[PDB]
Amino acid sequence: XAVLX
Amino acid sequence: AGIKILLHPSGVVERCMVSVVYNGSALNGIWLKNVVYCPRHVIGKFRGDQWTHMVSIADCRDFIVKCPIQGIQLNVQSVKMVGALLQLTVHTNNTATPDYKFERLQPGSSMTIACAYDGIVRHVYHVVLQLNNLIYASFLNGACGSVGYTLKGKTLYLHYMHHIEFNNKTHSGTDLEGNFYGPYVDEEVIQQQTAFQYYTDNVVAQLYAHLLTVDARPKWLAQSQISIEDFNSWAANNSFANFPCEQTNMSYIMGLSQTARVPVERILNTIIQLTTNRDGACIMGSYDFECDWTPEMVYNQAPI
Numbered sequence: 463x464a465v466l467x
Numbered sequence: 468a469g470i471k472i473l474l475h476p477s478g479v480v481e482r483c484m485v486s487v488v489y490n491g492s493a494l495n496g497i498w499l500k501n502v503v504y505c506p507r508h509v510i511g512k513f514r515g516d517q518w519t520h521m522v523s524i525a526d527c528r529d530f531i532v533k534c535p536i537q538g539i540q541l542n543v544q545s546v547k548m549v550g551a552l553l554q555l556t557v558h559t560n561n562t563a564t565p566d567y568k569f570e571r572l573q574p575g576s577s578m579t580i581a582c583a584y585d586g587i588v589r590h591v592y593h594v595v596l597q598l599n600n601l602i603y604a605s606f607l608n609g610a611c612g613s614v615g616y617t618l619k620g621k622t623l624y625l626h627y628m629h630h631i632e633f634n635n636k637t638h639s640g641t642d643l644e645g646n647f648y649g650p651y652v653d654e655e656v657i658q659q660q661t662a663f664q665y666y667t668d669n670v671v672a673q674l675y676a677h678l679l680t681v682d683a684r685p686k687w688l689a690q691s692q693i694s695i696e697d698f699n700s701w702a703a704n705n706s707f708a709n710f711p712c713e714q715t716n717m718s719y720i721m722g723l724s725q726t727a728r729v730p731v732e733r734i735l736n737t738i739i740q741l742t743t744n745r746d747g748a749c750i751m752g753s754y755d756f757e758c759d760w761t762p763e764m765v766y767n768q769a770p771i
Contacts, residue, residue, distance in 0.1 A: 463656065464632070464655050464656060464658055465655055466508050466512060466630065466653060467604075467606035467630060467632050467640070
């Protein structure tokens with residue numbers, strides 16, 4: 463549910 | 468006369484931006500004095516408490532740091548993890564380093580985002596830290612390390628550095644001290660966010676800004692008023708923060724009420740009515756309630 467830029 | 472979303476000039480930030488490339492990952496960083504600050508997840512996508520050992524064994528030679536504006540390649544002599552950030556000591560001191568301050572941002576405050584890629588600020592836009600400690604920004608891969616900042620007379624106030632994007636296209640990061648805003652971490656897992664809540668001070672500012680630039684007497688303006696105390700009782704059940712969220716905002720709001728000749732009690736009742744009667748009305752160039760207009764930035768551009 464979340465992604466590192 | 469005209470009230471706009473004012474942004475701070477990004478030239479000072481541009482001269483300090485650098486690119487950090489550690490093996491596979493490539494992101495951005497800021498270079499102040501002899502220290503380069505950048506997100507820690509450039510050395511890998513780790514979790515919990517393994518960052519201390521992973522950073523302590525990271526080779527300084529694997530850090531490729533380049534300042535594109537100044538055309539200078541940097542060499543890292545030491546690596547220090549401060550919070551969720553890495554403090555890379557470099558040999559060269561940035562001659563473009565301004566008088567800067569690391570100021571943590573409270574919710575409801577605005578800031579300019581210098582969206583950068585490969586160390587070059589590509590775009591610049593305005594955000595406000597929401598009550599859920601998230602910003603609603605615009606980023607792609609490689610944009611991590613972009614900074615959020617403000618200015619106060621050649622003094623650069625850094626407040627934010629980008630880290631992570633959530634599926635709802637909300638964004639989270641740390642201050643320049645390494646500590647995240649809210650209970651979010653730099654991990655690609657499901658993280659719960661507190662329910663959205665409107666920064667009522669800013670929503671009041673948006674409505675006042677419309678009264679001073681678009682229409683002083685619009686049709687959706689309430690012909691009725693409600694007390695602050697009665698509004699706060701309604702606000703508890705309608706995702707609106709207790710008014711006022713900042714006592715210092717009252718001087719700006721009272722000034723706006725005197726200029727627009729509309730008391731704040733009329734604005735607050737308009738907010739309540741707009742929850743059920745807006746029907747797609749465009750208010751200050753927006754189709755919904757915005758927290759991007761702060762009372763200070765609206766009052767600073769108003770007559771008297």
